[PDB]
Structures are given as C-alpha cells and as structure tokens.
Amino acid sequence: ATAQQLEYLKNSIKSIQDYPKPGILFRDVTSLLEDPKAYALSIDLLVERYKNAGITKVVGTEARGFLFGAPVALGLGVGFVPVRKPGKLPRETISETYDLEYGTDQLEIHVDAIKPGDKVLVVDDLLATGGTIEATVKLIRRLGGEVADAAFIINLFDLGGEQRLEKQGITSYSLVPFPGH
Amino acid sequence: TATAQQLEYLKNSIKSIQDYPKPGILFRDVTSLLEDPKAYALSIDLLVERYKNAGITKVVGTEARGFLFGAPVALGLGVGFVPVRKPGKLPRETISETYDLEYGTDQLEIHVDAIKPGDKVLVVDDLLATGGTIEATVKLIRRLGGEVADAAFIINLFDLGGEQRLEKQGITSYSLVPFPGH
Ligand SMILES: [Mg+2]
C-alpha cells in the first residue's frame, strides 16, 4: 500500500469524540463502508497482501468482521468460515471462552469447516485487545488448521493486541493505525 | 439471467438439516454455500448482474447474514453499503423499527445519514422466511427518503409467505434458491 492509499483510508473513517464515554474516540468504519472507493481499496489491499500466501480459508468473527473477511475470501477465491456466538451455527461446533471486562463470552466454529492442512487467514475490522482473535486461533488449531496471519482494517496500537497475537505466533497486518483506548 | 445449471449448482451447495432447530422442519444451511468458493462467488456475481442496470445507489444488509451477501453485492455494483443492525451497535444517530419474532419482538436500526432522498436501495439477505426483518428494513429506508422496490435473497422458503408480505409493500423479491417446507 502506498502512502497515498493509506492516507485515503485513514481519512475515510469517522472518529466520534467522547464515545462511548469522555476521553474515548470511537473509530466508525461505517463511513468507510458507505464510500465505494474506500471500501473497495481496503479489500483490494488485503487481497493483494495474501494472494501468494497459500490461504485456503478465510475466517471472520461476527459481525463487523464479516464485512471484511467475506470480500477478502471472495477476492482470494477461497471459502469463508464464520465464527459466531453460541446459538447461531446449525451444524456441529466446538467452542472457546474469552474474557471481557465484567465476565466472559464464547465463540464457536463449525467442526467441518476447517480441515487438517488448511492454511487460514483471520480477518476482522479492528484490532483492540485481541481477545476474540486469540480464541479464534485456538478454534482453528483444534481442528488441525494452520494459522499464522490476521488482517485488520484498524489497529488500535495502544491496546496491545498485536503483541498478544504474536504470543500465539500470529503476524498482524493492519491498514489504519489509531491511538487511544 | 442465471442458467438452470448455475441455479442447480447453488441449490446443491446448500446443506439441509433434518428436524432442526426442531422436529418437522427441514433447515436450509447457507453456511455450506459460504464454504464453497465457487458457490459463494457465483451467488454474488449473479445478484450483481441482476441489478447492474437498476440504478441502485446503495445496498442495505441486516446484521449479520446481510453483511455476508449484501456487502459483496455493494462492492460488485460499486455503490456504498449500509448496515442495518441490532439495537445499540451503530455509534451515530439512528432511527428504529420493531418487528415480530416467534417469541416476541425486537428492533432494527439504521444510521439516519446513511440514506438520503434520491437514493435507490437494494436490500440483500441470506434467506426469506416470514419477511419480518425485511419489512422493517423497508420502513427504515423509506423513513429516510430512500426508494426501495427490490429485495434479493440466496434462499426463499416460499411456503412461509415472505414474498407476498413484501409485495404488499411494493417490493419485488428475487431469490436464487427456492425451497419448500416450514
Ligand atoms: Mg470473481
């Protein structure tokens, strides 16, 4: 990606001051979704980055993740595998629990969607704590899939998500870096 | 339009789960279509081709299946994508519409600035059942001044009356894979 393209993407994202609370800047990707060039550029750049990586499956967590993982899967010509909260996926699944501020939650994946030997690319809209991605990586590996890459539109470099994923052997690629918690 | 062979390939890419989520109903699982790169790409390409000359200016998809099918269609048409979401997810100003579910009601929201007078919208979703969420989505779009007369689906459970319900709103539904049953 060129300096000009990265600048275009950064400017396509709206930042909401003091939301959800004072001192925090909400990075709203819906403004990027609304803009034809910005959305297409974001997908095209991710596809270009992984076109020669031998990816056989793209995994995306519900829901905003779907907006980027699915188009990347189509661009790479590989199947898309959703990871969701319990109660949505209809076929056999395995689950992983992840931590939240005042509690925990779970993510599930179809057991038959990832086969031993698959090389997986995880795609999400924004990298913050990295908790959901950490759980997703564990799901993929429990099914024998290989995953060493995670791609994001936005990276909140202040929250330590990139380092957390590196502890799992994951290299993160992000298009737009933003500060703040 | 789609060839019989293409429609057949799409129909065969969808897994049917007997007696799920409860006995008597034959579920149609679109996730197996998502897993097949050929079926997924074909379905998106066909929807784009169907509406390429319809003057569409925005594609709306509800959380989260509508993301999976509506977003790629928006990209194929080269127009903006607008998400309709569950309550409290969208960060900017929104309007809401209530719709019925088996055990009650719920709401769908849309950003007020996402649709403007003059916009011609295409709604895309994975499956047409009762049509409740799409009916609510059409109301949201029109409250913002958008014009919507088209809804596209991967699957249409024609025995559930969704298509007729949407026709009462002036919506013409286009579906790739029709299936019988509840
Ligand atoms: Mg293609």
Curated annotation (Swiss-Prot), chain B:
Homodimer. It is found in: Cytoplasm. It comes from Escherichia coli (strain K12). Gene3D superfamilies: 3.40.50.2020. Its EC number is 2.4.2.7. Belongs to the purine/pyrimidine phosphoribosyltransferase family. The keyword Cytoplasm applies. GO terms for cellular component: cytosol. Its main location: cytoplasm. PROSITE patterns: PUR_PYR_PR_TRANSFER. It holds the Pfam family Pribosyltran. The keyword Glycosyltransferase applies. GO terms for biological process: adenine salvage; AMP salvage; purine ribonucleoside salvage. CDD domains: PRTases_typeI. NCBIfam families: apt, PRK02304.1-1, PRK02304.1-2, PRK02304.1-3, PRK02304.1-5. Pathway: Purine metabolism; AMP biosynthesis via salvage pathway; AMP from adenine: step 1/1. It is an enzyme of class 2 (transferase). It catalyses: AMP + diphosphate = 5-phospho-alpha-D-ribose 1-diphosphate + adenine. This is Adenine phosphoribosyltransferase. One of its GO terms (molecular function) is adenine phosphoribosyltransferase activity. Catalyzes a salvage reaction resulting in the formation of AMP, that is energically less costly than de novo synthesis. Keywords: Cytoplasm, Glycosyltransferase, Purine salvage, Transferase.
